[PDB]
């Protein structure tokens, strides 16, 4: 699809334009908080994190050309999604992954929640440094994004996606 263009190198990893204003990535690849990014200084944007999910909101659209997509909080187990892996070479691998159940993890010093998935099918699969690449699927007749890649199991086909879910309560003052 044209979409592959949304995926871009970022810090020590990758990230994704959900909308003109919204850029998501894996928190551990991101450059330190308050770094000048895409030629914007802090204050041009607002960053919300959620585990190892990291969302930048830009007051002014940074990618004006691009439509919004729906950003779900993970998806149902058994749904077949697809990871959009770009490699530094520019090579583009659509990896199919059947999504699984939730699962905690440690990124160093910090336990973080994710949805696991089991890569469907040699060379193949993921590497560290794919972190950030998105997981997306076709819900009925259109496409949504459900999380970002964080890591893959030493053993075989299992991968973890970080997810972002909207807050449901609020504290006062």
Numbering used by the authors: 3 to 123, 130 to 181
Task: Give me lines lifted from the publication on this model.
Whereas ORF2, ORF3 and ORF4 each encode single proteins, ORF1 codes for a large polyprotein (∼190 kDa) that is processed by the virally-encoded protease at five specific sites to release the six ‘mature’ non-structural proteins (NS1/2–NS7)—and an array of functional precursors—that are required for virus replication. The viral NS6 protease present within the C-terminal half of the polyprotein performs all the processing, including its own autocatalytic release from the precursor. Norovirus NS6 is a cysteine protease with a chymotrypsin-like fold: two β-barrel domains separated by a cleft that contains a Cys-His-Asp/Glu catalytic triad similar in arrangement to the Ser-His-Asp triad characteristic of serine proteases. To this end we extended an inactive MNV NS6 construct (which incorporates a C139A mutation to knock out the active site nucleophile) by adding residues from NS7, which is immediately downstream in the polyprotein.
We made three constructs, NS6 1′, NS6 2′ and NS6 4′, which were extended by 1, 2 and 4 residues respectively, generating proteases that contain substrates that correspond to P4–P1′, P4-P2′ and P4-P4′ of the NS6–NS7 cleavage junction. MNV NS6 2′ crystallised in space group P6122 with two molecules in the asymmetric unit. The electron density indicates the positions of residues 3-181 in chain A and 4-181 in chain B, but is not good enough to allow complete modelling of the N- or C-termini. The two monomers found in the asymmetric unit are related by a quasi-2-fold symmetry axis and form an apparent homodimer with an interface area of 1,097 Å2. In addition to neighbourly contacts made by the two C-termini, dimerization within the crystal is stabilised by hydrogen bonds involving Ser 51, Ser 111 and Val 113 of chain A and Ser 51, Ser 52, Ser 111 and Val 113 of chain B. Although the C-termini within the asymmetric unit each embrace the other monomer, reaching into the groove formed between the bII-cII and eII-fII loops, they are again not located within the substrate-binding site. Following anisotropy analysis the MNV NS6 2′ data were truncated to 3.2 Å, 3.2 Å, and 2.7 Å along a∗, b∗ and c∗ directions. The anisotropic truncation of the data, with the new limit of 2.7 Å along the c∗ axis, resulted in a dramatic increase in the number of unique reflections from 8,555 in the “pre-treated” data to 12,786. Anisotropic treatment of the MNV NS6 2′ data also improved the molecular replacement outcome, with a unique solution found by Phaser in contrast with the two possible solutions of the uncorrected data. Nevertheless, this resulted in immediate improvements in refinement: Rwork dropped from 32.5 to 30.3% while Rfree was reduced from 42.0 to 39.0%. These statistics were further improved to Rwork of 25.4% and Rfree of 30.3% in the final structure.
